[PDB]
Design a protein around this ligand. Structure first.
Ligand SMILES: CS(=O)(=O)c1ccc(COc2cc(C(=O)O)ccc2-c2nn(C(=O)c3c(Cl)cccc3C(F)(F)F)c3ccc(Cl)cc23)cc1
Ligand SMILES: CS(=O)(=O)c1ccc(COc2cc(C(=O)O)ccc2-c2nn(C(=O)c3c(Cl)cccc3C(F)(F)F)c3ccc(Cl)cc23)cc1
Lengths: 259, 259
């Protein structure tokens, strides 16, 4: 692969990335820093009870920490259809065996949600509703019994991840790399998936050297994050499993949020 | 007004979710029913002697058949639910509108998709391994005999249109997104999505059945009939319940009906 072909693959994903996802990282960083119609801030129970009436949330039908929990699930399901659509533009993806496509997404969406969620997060809280809102980390971390400790590990990850200082052109490729993992359980034909990931890895390597020439071994250091990424996704589901056996939904709803 | 290229994209997107969400396609089901094959060959159930043997093979009578359908309907509801999540726009509607669209739309879609498993003489069962003759079901006792046949009756008429899975994937999507369901909160954005699916359905049919005079018009007129048979169906279940008190329904099905 000559440099000309990789740079082309980079723009192809960067362009598709911009179209697929509602709030890019460049906009979210301008909002958080304060360089841009301020977001409505959620810092306690009373302000959330206001933000729902104001910034009318679509997941509203209930106890406070549960409602926060379920609004996240609503946003996750949405992001899953967003990532699914982005995958279709990864050169090669739509030519995979259809079962391999379903498998790659089934297993990759949590690591990619966790990743892109770092784009909307800083030390102190997280952007919501396409940047219209801001929910403080102090508030999320303070929620009761299980719900408090379910929220904080996200902020903890994102603070470490954001130290890498990636932008949207870096992330468009890094995301494509996650999807095309050849070690997902039960793939039928691994070779062409590794073939594509070897191509994206090549595109990721070059992008980083061009876009961060002063950041020694940034490529290696981001690949070690995918190590870290495997751990929080496991933690996550073993924390989901625990919520269910204690806390609470409508049978039709349960099918949507299944898995 | 969407550009032709954008619509055709929507068709391919939906056909692809259809192949992925539903296990027994219509193309496969017509391959079994036609026959001419040795491996794709159903065990036929036409009486009790055949029923007692197929259980070993395919692995009171009318009750167990009644119960087998409901277990199978629950499965189809989970399959349709997963399909709904990929209809572009669906997961972004008001959550209660989502439940409403599904609550009313699943029966209309099972009946449509059950016609794929049907010819004048019977129905595939157990993912195509089995086949149950219409005559036998029609011969079941008390109320249960007349419970099975109206499916065959609608299905023979519907299948005369000769649609394939690329046509049905869109027609199914159009059904889910009906803005005239009881109790929707935001009718406008549901219609907005349905106008695009209608647009996508018209073109697909005009291209895939160019020798079919007014196939689009005739196919929308089938949505008339479907509305009636769900009424008939739920009113015959209600009557069976006041007769067969042993019998229990599935909570997910139980939730859909109470409406
Ligand atoms: C209380 S509200 O209704 O006003 C409310 C609405 C919206 C949010 C923002 O949340 C997210 C936004 C995007 C996005 O914009 O791309 C992506 C993810 C989340 C989010 N997912 N998530 C999970 O638990 C989770 C995760 Cl990580 C991975 C997979 C599945 C899940 C699931 F399914 F369990 F949900 C969070 C936990 C904490 C926080 Cl802080 C955010 C998230 C917050 C509050
Ligand atoms: C005796 S068995 O266990 O081997 C057995 C298993 C499976 C069948 C096939 O049946 C179906 C298969 C599929 C499918 O494959 O997608 C889809 C639907 C039905 C089916 N549902 N149904 C109902 O009454 C019904 C319906 Cl439509 C909608 C909602 C709820 C119900 C419920 F709950 F009231 F039941 C039928 C009635 C007659 C016939 Cl002919 C078929 C069906 C047959 C035998």
């Amino acid at each position: 692969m000559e440099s000309a072909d990789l740079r082309a693959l980079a723009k192809h994903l960067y362009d598709s990335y911009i179209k697929s996802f509602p709030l890019t990282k460049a906009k979210a960083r301008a909002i958080l820093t304060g360089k841009t119609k301020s977001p409505f801030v959620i810092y306690d129970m009373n302000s959330l009870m206001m933000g729902e009436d104001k910034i009318k949330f679509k997941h509203i039908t209930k106890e406070v920490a549960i409602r926060i929990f379920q609004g996240c699930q609503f946003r996750s399901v949405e992001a899953v259809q967003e990532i699914t659509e982005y995958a279709k533009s990864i050169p090669g993806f739509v030519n995979l065996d259809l079962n391999d496509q379903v498998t790659l997404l089934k297993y990759g969406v949590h690591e990619i949600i966790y990743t892109m969620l770092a784009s909307l997060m800083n030390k102190d809280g997280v952007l919501i509703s396409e940047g219209q809102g801001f929910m403080t980390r102090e508030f999320l971390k303070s929620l009761r019994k299980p719900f408090g400790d379910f929220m904080e590990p996200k902020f903890e990850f994102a603070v470490k991840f954001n130290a890498l200082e990636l932008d949207d052109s870096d992330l468009a490729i890094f995301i494509a790399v996650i999807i095309l993992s050849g070690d997902r359980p039960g793939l039928l034909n691994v070779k062409p998936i590794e073939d594509i990931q070897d191509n994206l890895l090549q595109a990721l390597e070059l992008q980083l050297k061009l876009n961060h020439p002063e950041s020694s071994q940034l490529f290696a250091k981001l690949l070690q994050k995918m190590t870290d990424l495997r751990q929080i996704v496991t933690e996550h589901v073993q924390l989901l499993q625990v919520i269910k056996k204690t806390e609470t939904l409508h049978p039709l709803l349960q099918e949507i949020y299944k898995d």
